[PDB]
Structure formats: structure tokens, C-alpha cells
PDB file of N, CA and C and ligand atoms in Angstrom:
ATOM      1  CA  UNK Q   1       2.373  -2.789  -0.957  1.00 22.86           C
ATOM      2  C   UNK Q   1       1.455  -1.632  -1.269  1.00 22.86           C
ATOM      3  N   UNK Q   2       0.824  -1.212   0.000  1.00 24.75           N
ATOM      4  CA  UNK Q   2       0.000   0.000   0.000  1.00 24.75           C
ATOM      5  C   UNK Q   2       0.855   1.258   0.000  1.00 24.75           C
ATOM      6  N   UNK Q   3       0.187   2.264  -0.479  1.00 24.31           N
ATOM      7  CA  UNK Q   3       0.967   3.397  -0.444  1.00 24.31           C
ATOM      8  C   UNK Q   3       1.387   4.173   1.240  1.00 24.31           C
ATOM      9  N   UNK Q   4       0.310   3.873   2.130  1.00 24.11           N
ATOM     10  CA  UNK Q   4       0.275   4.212   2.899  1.00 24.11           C
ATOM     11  C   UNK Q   4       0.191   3.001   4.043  1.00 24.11           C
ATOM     12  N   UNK Q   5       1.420   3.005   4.990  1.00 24.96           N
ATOM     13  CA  UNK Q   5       1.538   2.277   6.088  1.00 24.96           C
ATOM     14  C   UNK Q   5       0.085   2.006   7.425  1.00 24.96           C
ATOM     15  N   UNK Q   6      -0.066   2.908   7.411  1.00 26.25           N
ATOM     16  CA  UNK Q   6      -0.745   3.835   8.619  1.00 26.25           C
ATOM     17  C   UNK Q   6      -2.435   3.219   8.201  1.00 26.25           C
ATOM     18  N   UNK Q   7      -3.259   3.338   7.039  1.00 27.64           N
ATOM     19  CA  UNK Q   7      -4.271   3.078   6.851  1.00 27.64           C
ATOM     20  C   UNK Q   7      -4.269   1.571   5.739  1.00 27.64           C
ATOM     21  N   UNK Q   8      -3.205   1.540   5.249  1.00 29.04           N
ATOM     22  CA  UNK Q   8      -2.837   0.436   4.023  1.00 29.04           C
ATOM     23  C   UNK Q   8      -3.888   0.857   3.093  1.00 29.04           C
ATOM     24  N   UNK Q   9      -4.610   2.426   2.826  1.00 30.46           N
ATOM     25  CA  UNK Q   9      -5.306   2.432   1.414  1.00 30.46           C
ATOM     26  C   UNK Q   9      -6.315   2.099   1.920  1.00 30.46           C
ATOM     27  N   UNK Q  10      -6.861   2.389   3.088  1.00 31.67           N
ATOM     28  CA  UNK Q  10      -8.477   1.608   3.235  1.00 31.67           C
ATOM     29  C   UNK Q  10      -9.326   3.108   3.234  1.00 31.67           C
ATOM     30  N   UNK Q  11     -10.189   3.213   1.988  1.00 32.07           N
ATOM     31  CA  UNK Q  11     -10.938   4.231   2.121  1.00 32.07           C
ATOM     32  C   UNK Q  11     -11.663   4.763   3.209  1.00 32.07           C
ATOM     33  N   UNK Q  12     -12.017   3.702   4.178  1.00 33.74           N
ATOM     34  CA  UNK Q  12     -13.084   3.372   5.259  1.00 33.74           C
ATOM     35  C   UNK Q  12     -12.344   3.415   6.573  1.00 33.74           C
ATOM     36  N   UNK Q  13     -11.305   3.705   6.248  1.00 34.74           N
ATOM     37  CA  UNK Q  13     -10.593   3.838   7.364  1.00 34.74           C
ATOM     38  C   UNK Q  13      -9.891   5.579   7.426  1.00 34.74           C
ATOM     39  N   UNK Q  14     -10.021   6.019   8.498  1.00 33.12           N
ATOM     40  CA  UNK Q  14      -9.587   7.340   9.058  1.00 33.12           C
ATOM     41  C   UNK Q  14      -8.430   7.642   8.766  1.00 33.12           C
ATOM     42  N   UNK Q  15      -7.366   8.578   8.186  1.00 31.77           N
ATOM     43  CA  UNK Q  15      -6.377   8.337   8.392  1.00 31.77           C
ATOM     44  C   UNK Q  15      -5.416   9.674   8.274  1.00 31.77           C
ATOM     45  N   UNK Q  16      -4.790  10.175   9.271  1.00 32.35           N
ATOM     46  CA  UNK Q  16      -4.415  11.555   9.380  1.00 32.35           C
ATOM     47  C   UNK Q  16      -3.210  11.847   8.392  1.00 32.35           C
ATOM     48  N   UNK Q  17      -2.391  10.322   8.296  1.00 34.30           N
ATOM     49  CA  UNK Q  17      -0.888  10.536   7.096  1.00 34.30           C
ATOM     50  C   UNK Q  17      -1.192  10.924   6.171  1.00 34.30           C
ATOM     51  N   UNK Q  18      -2.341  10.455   5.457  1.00 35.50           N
ATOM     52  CA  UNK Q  18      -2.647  10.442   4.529  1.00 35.50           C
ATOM     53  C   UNK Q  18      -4.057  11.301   3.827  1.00 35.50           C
ATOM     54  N   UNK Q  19      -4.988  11.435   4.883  1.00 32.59           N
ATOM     55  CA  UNK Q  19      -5.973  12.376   4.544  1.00 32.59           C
ATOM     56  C   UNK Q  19      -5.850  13.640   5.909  1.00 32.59           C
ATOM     57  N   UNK Q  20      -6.854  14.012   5.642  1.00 33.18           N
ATOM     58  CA  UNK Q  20      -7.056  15.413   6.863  1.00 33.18           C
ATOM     59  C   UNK Q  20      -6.490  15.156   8.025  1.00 33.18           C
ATOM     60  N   UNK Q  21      -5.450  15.500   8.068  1.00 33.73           N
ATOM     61  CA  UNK Q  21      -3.894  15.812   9.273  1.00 33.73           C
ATOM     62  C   UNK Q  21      -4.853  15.872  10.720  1.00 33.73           C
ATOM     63  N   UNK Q  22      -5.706  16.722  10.612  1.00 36.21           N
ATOM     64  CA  UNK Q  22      -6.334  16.851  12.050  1.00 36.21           C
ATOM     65  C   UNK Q  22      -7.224  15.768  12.391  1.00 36.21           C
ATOM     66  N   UNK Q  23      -8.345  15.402  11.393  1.00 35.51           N
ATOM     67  CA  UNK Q  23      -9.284  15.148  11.630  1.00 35.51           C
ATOM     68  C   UNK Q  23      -9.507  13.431  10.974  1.00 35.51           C
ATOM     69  N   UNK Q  24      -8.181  13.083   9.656  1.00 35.54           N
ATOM     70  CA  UNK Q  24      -8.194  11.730   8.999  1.00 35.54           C
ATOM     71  C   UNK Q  24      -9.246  11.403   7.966  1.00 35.54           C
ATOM     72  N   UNK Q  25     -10.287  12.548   8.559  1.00 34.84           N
ATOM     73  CA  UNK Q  25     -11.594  12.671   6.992  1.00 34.84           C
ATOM     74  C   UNK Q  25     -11.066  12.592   6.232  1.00 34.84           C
ATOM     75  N   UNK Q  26     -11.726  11.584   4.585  1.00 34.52           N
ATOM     76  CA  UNK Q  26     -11.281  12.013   3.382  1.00 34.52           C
ATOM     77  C   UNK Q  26     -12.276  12.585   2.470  1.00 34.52           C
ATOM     78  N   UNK Q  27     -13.639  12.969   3.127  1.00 35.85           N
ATOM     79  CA  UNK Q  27     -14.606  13.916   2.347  1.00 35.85           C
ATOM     80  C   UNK Q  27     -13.896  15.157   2.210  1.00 35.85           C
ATOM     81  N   UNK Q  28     -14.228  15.758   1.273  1.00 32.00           N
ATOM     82  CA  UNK Q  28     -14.393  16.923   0.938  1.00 32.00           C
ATOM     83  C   UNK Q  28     -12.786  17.185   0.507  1.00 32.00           C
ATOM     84  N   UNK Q  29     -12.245  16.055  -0.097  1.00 37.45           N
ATOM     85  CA  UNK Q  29     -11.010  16.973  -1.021  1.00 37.45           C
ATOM     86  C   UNK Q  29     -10.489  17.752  -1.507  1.00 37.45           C
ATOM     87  N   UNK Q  30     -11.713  18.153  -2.621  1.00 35.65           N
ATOM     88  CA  UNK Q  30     -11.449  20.197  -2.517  1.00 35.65           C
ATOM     89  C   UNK Q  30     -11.363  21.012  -1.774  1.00 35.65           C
ATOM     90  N   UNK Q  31     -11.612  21.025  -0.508  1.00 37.57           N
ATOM     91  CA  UNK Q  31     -11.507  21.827   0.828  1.00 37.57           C
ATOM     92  C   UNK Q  31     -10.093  21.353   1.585  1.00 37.57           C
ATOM     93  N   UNK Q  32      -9.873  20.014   0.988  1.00 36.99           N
ATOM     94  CA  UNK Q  32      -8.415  19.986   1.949  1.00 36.99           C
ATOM     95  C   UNK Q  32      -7.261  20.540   0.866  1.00 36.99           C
ATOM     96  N   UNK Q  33      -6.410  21.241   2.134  1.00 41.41           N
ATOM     97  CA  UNK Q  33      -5.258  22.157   1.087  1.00 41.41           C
ATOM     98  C   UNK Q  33      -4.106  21.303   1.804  1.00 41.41           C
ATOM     99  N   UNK Q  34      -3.410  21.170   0.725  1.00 38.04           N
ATOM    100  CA  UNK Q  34      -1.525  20.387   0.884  1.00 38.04           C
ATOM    101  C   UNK Q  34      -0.655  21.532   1.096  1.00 38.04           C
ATOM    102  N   UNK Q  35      -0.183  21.062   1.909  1.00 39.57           N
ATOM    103  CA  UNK Q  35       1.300  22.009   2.527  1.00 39.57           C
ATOM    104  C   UNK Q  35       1.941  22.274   1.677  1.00 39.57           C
ATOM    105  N   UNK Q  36       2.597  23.147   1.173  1.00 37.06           N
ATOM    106  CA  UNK Q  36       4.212  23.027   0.365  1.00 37.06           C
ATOM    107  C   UNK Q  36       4.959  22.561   1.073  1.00 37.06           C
ATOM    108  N   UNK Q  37       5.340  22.583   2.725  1.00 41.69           N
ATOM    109  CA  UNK Q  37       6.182  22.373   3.167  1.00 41.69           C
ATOM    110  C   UNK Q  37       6.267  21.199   3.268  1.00 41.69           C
ATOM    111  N   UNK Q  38       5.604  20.188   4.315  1.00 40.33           N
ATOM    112  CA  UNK Q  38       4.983  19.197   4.457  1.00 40.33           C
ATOM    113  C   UNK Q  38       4.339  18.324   4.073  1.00 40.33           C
ATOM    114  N   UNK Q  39       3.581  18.791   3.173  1.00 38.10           N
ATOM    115  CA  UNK Q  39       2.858  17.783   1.755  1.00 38.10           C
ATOM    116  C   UNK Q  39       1.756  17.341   2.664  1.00 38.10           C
ATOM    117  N   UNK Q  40       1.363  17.415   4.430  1.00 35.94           N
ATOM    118  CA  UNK Q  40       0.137  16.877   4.735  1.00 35.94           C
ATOM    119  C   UNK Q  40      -1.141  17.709   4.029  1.00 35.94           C
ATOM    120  N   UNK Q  41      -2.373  17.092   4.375  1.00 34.56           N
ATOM    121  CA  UNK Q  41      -3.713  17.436   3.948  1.00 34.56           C
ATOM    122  C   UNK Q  41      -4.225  18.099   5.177  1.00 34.56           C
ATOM    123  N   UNK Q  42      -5.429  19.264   4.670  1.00 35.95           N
ATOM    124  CA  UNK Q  42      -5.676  19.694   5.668  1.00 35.95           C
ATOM    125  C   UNK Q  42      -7.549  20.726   5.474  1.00 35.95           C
ATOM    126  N   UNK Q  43      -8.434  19.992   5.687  1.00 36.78           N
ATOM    127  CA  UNK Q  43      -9.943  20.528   5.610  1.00 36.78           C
ATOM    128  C   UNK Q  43      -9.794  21.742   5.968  1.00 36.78           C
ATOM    129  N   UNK Q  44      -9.877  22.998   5.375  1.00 31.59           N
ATOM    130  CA  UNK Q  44     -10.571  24.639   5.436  1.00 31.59           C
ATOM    131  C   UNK Q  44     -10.807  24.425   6.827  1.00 31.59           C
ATOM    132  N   UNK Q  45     -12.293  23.589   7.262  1.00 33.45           N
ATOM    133  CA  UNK Q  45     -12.980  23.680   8.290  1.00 33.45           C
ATOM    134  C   UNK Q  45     -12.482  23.122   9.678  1.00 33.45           C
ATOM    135  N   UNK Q  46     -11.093  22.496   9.344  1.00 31.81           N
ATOM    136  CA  UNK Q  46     -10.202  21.764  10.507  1.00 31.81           C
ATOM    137  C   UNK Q  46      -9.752  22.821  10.769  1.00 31.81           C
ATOM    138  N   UNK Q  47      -8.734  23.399  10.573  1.00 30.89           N
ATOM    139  CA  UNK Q  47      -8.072  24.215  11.069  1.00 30.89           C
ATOM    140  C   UNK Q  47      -8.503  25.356  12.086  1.00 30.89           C
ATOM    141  N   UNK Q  48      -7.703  25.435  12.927  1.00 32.40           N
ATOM    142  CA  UNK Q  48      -8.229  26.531  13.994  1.00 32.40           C
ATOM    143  C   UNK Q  48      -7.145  27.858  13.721  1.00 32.40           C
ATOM    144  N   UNK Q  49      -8.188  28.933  13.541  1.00 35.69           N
ATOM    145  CA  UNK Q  49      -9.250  29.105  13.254  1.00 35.69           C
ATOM    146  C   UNK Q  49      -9.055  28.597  11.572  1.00 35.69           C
ATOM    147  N   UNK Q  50     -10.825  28.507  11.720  1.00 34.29           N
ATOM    148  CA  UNK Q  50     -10.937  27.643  10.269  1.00 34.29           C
ATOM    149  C   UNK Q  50     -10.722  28.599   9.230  1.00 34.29           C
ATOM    150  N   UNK Q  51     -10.917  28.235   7.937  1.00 37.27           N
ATOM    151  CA  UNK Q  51     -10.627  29.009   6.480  1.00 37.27           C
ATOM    152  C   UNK Q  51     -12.227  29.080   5.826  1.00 37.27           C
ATOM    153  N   UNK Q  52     -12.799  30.214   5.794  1.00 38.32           N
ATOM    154  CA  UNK Q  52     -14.355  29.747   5.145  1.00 38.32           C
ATOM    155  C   UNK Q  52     -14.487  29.489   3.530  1.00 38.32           C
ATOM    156  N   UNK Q  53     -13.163  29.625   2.928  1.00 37.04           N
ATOM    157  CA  UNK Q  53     -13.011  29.015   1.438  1.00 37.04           C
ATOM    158  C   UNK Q  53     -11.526  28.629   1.260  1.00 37.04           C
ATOM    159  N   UNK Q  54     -11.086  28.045  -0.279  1.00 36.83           N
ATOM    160  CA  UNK Q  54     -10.270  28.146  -0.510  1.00 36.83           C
ATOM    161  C   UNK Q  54      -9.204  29.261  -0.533  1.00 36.83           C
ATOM    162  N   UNK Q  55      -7.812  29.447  -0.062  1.00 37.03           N
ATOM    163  CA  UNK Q  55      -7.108  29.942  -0.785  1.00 37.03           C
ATOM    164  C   UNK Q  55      -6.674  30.716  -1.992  1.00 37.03           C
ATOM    165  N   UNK Q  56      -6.776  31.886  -2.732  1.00 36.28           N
ATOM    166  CA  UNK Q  56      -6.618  31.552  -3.980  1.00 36.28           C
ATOM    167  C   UNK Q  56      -4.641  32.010  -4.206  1.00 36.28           C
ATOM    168  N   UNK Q  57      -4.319  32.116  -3.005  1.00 39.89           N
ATOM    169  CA  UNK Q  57      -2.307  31.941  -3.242  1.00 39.89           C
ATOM    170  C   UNK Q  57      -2.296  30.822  -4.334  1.00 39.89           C
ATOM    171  N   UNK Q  58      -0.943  30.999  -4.755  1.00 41.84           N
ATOM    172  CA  UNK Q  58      -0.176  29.951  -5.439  1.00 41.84           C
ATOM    173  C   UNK Q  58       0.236  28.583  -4.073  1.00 41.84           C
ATOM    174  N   UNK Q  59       0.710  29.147  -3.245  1.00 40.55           N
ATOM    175  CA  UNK Q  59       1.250  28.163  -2.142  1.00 40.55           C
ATOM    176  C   UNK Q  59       0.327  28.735  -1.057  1.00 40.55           C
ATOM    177  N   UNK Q  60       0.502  27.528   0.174  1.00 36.78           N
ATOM    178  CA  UNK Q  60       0.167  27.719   1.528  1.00 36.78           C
ATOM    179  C   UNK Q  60       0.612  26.947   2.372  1.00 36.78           C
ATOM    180  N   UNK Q  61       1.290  27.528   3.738  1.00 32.65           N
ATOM    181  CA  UNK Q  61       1.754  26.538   4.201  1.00 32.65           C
ATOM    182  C   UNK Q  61       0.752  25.853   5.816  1.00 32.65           C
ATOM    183  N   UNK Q  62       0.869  24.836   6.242  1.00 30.54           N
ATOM    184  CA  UNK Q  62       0.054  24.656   7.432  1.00 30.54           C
ATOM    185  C   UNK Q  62       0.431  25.060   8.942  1.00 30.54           C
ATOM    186  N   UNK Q  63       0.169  25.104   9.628  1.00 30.21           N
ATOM    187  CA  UNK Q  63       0.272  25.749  11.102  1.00 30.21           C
ATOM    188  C   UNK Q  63       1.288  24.751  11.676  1.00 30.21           C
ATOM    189  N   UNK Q  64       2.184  23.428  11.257  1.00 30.91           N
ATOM    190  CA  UNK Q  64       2.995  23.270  11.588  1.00 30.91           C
ATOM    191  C   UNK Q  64       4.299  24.054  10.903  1.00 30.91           C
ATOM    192  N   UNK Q  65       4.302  24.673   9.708  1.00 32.06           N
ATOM    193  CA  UNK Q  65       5.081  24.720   9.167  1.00 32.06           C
ATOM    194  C   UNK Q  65       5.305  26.051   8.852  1.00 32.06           C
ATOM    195  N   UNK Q  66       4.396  27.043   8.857  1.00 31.26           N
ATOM    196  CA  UNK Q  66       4.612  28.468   8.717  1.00 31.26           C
ATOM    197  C   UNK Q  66       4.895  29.086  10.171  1.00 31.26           C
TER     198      UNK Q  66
ATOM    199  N   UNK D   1      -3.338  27.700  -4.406  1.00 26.32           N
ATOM    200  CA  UNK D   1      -3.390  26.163  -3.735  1.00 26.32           C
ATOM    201  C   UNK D   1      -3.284  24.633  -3.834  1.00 26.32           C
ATOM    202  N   UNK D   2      -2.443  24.017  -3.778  1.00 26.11           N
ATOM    203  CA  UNK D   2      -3.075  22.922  -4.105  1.00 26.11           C
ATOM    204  C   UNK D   2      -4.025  21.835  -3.332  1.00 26.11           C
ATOM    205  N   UNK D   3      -4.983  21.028  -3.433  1.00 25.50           N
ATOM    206  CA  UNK D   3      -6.018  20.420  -2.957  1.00 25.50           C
ATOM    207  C   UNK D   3      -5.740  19.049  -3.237  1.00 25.50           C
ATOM    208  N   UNK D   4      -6.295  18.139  -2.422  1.00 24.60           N
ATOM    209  CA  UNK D   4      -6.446  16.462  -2.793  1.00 24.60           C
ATOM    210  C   UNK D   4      -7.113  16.191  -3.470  1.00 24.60           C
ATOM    211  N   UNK D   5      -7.908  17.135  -4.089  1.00 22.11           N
ATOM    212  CA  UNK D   5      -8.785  17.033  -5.569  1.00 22.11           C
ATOM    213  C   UNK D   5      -7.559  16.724  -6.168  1.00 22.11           C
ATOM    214  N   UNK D   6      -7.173  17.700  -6.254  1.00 22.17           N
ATOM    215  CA  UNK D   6      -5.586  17.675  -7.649  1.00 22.17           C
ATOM    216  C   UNK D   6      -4.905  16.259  -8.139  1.00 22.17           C
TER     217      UNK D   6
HETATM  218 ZN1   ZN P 101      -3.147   6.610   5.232  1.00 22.14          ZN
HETATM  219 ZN1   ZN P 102     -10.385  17.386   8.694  1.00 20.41          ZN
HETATM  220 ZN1   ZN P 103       3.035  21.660   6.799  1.00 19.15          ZN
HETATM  221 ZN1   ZN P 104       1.336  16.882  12.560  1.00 18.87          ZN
END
């Protein structure tokens, strides 16, 4: 093999490596934004405080990394 | 941005 250790690729399974860093959701893909730094995923609506849309930067980085 | 859409 799976790409991912942590969930082994199971849609049905939660998984923070690999989907929403905070929360492991993998709904709402378009709402999760990738780090430049880090490359994790991360839901608008996870983040504290949250984001009420996309981005429209070229880059963004996440609250571990900026 | 990029998204997990992408
Ligand atoms: Zn995973
Ligand atoms: Zn989330
Ligand atoms: Zn980051
Ligand atoms: Zn982390």
C-alpha cells in the first residue's frame, strides 16, 4: 504494498498521514489544502481558526510549518 | 493552492 503504512489504502478507514492531518476525513477533497512544506492534507474547516473558502495563493503553508 | 482534488 500500500501506499500508505498507517491506513494500508483503506478508504473506510480514518487516516491523518494520509488524509485530513487533524481530523483523517477524506470527504471533501477540494476543501483539503496540501502544505508546500509538508505535503500533509488539511480541511478549510479543521483548522483553527478555520478558512471559510479556498485559498486563492499559489502556495500555503500549514500551522505546523509556517 | 493545491487540494487532494488535484
Ligand atoms: Zn493513510
Ligand atoms: Zn479534517
Ligand atoms: Zn506543513
Ligand atoms: Zn502533525
Amino acid at each position: 504494498g500500500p501506499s500508505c503504512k498507517h491506513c494500508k489504502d483503506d478508504v473506510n478507514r480514518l487516516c491523518r498521514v494520509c488524509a485530513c492531518h487533524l481530523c483523517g476525513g477524506r470527504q471533501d477533497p477540494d476543501k483539503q489544502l496540501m502544505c508546500d512544506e509538508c505535503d500533509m492534507a488539511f480541511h478549510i474547516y479543521c483548522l483553527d481558526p478555520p478558512l471559510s473558502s479556498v485559498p486563492s495563493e499559489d502556495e500555503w503553508y500549514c500551522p505546523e510549518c509556517r | 493552492v493545491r487540494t487532494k482534488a488535484d
